[PDB]
């Protein structure tokens, strides 16, 4: 009818319908924190508009946009500020066009144990699109970067419902901002954004957490230190060793700002109980990461004691998913699958989880148990 | 014209309960977001949890609550949630 347990305790969460989407998995209504069920992520590489997540934290989100009087302002340490109509972005600009995953820091977050404080999310806050606009190098070529830059801050037409709240306002390195990917999209798998995706334009940080993602975006300054507004002074942050981990109930001594993906994989085509027939089973499913290239996806029918390599799928982009194939002769009797990817610099996933305050960038090789018959 | 965007109707509440902080946090603790927010957390998490959730609130978004009445919504929530 309309619930959904999630796999973890307090699971019960609503389905819910919002203009131009499916019925998604209610998180929380004001703001909007819609997630993906997770059956979608096996119908294809690409995530419809209609299924995408949907995350935010300020209740004062746009609802009512004109796009013709819509203005994106770039301004601080350039040489001649602009203001930029969504007409000028798509007839003064080449057009750029990238694969690329989005995700949320805390995808996954209901899954770490000890059970941490946030977003209670399985693992359906995260999308894969085809998005189109202005690379942000561009734009900010035209304006003139000063020298001496050194961050670029985003900002959009979300507020606060009271003033004293923090803006939602994130950066970039200057040359992150520069580098010819960080793109300004004002398309997503050929449409206009959807509204709950940032429509009219949102920046696209392929390879990094959705929270520097800023939707509705119309403000970008180039500044000349760095930024220390609250959502990157002290939310967003990560412990700052190779892990980004600590142990289970201890705060990190030293942090950094969340930054690019690592390693994940997940099995699309079987979930915990599913049945199959003894024999060569089909399995498949998805593996993506910050952007190096997925090496290899190996899969195992015996809880992690043996492997075989699985085929990868044509890919779409280094940001995008990839897909994988595997077939694997399975007994009669249940089997704990798992799959498990690696990436062109030697990431790959841990088999035990591991664990910081925040409940981010979990990545644990994933564990689906099957009864073969 | 603009386009414009509906949202549904806004239905989450909070689980009723005799501590006065029930009604504390029905008056202090939906008047940024929808109290969702409160219903999803893991549960069973203890008094300091719900402390700190509360604490975070009032010192870092600056949810004008006073001191009785921080306790009253800890204390109900760590009783309820
Ligand atoms: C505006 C001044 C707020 C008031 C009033 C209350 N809270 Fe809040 N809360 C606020 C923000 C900006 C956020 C982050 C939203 C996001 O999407 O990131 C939250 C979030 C929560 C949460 C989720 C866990 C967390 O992020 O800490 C909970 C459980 C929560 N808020 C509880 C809560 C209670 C108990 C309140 C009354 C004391 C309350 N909130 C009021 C801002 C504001
Ligand atoms: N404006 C804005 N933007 C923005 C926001 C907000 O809140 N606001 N959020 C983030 C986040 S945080 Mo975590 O890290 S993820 C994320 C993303 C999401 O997206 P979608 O909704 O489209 O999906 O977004 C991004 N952006």
Redesign the pocket.
């Given at each position: 009818a309309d619930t959904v347990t999630l796999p973890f305790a307090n699971g019960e969460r609503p389905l819910v319908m919002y203009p131009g989407k499916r019925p998604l998995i209610g998180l929380?209504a004001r703001?909007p924190?819609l997630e993906t069920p997770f059956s979608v992520f096996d119908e294809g590489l690409i995530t419809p508009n209609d299924a995408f997540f949907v995350?935010?934290?300020?209740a004062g989100i746009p609802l009512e946009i004109d796009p013709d009087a819509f203005r994106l302002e770039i301004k601080g340490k350039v040489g001649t500020p602009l203001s930029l109509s969504l007409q000028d972005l798509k007839n003064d600009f080449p057009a750029s066009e990238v694969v690329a995953v989005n995700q949320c820091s805390g995808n996954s977050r209901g899954f770490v144990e000890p059970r941490v404080?946030?977003?209670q999310l399985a693992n359906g806050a995260m999308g894969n699109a085809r998005w189109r606009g202005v690379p942000l190098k561009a734009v900010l070529e035209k304006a003139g970067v000063q020298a001496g830059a050194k961050q670029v801050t985003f900002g959009g037409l979300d507020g606060?419902?009271?003033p004293?709240?923090p803006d939602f306002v994130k950066a970039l390195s200057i040359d992150h901002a520069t580098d010819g990917e960080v793109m300004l999209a004002y398309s997503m798998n050929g449409a206009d954004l959807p509204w709950l995706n940032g429509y009219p334009l949102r920046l696209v940080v392929p390879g990094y957490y959705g929270t520097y993602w800023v939707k509705h975006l119309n403000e970008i300054t180039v500044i000349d230190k760095e930024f220390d507004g609250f959502w990157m002074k002290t939310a967003y942050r990560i412990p700052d060793n190779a892990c980004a981990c600590t142990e289970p109930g201890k705060a990190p001594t030293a942090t950094i700002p969340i930054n690019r993906f690592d390693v994940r994989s997940f099995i699309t085509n079987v979930e915990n109980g599913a049945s199959v027939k003894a024999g060569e089973v089909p399995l498949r499913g998805i593996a993506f990461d910050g952007g190096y290239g997925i090496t290899q996806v190996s899969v195992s029918a015996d809880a992690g004691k043996s492997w075989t390599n699985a085929t990868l799928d044509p890919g779409l982009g280094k940001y995008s998913f990839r897909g994988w194939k595997a077939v694997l002769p399975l007994t009669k009797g249940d089997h704990v699958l798992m799959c498990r990817a690696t990436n062109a610099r030697g990431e790959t996933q841990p088999m035990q989880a591991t664990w910081n305050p925040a409940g981010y960038m979990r990545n644990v090789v994933e564990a689906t148990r099957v009864i073969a018959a | 014209a603009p386009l414009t965007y509906e949202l549904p109707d806004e239905t989450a509440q909070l689980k009723p309960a005799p501590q006065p902080g029930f009604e504390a946090?029905q008056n202090?603790?939906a008047?940024?977001?929808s109290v969702d927010?409160?219903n999803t957390?893991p549960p069973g998490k203890g008094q300091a949890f719900?402390d700190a959730?509360?604490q975070?609130?009032?010192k870092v978004?600056?949810?004008?609550?006073d001191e009785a009445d921080?306790k009253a919504?800890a204390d109900y929530?760590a009783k309820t949630y």
């Open positions: 929380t703001p924190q995350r935010y934290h300020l404080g946030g977003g606060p419902v009271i004293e709240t | 946090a202090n603790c008047a940024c977001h927010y409160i957390q719900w959730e509360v975070k609130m009032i978004y600056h949810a004008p609550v921080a919504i929530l």
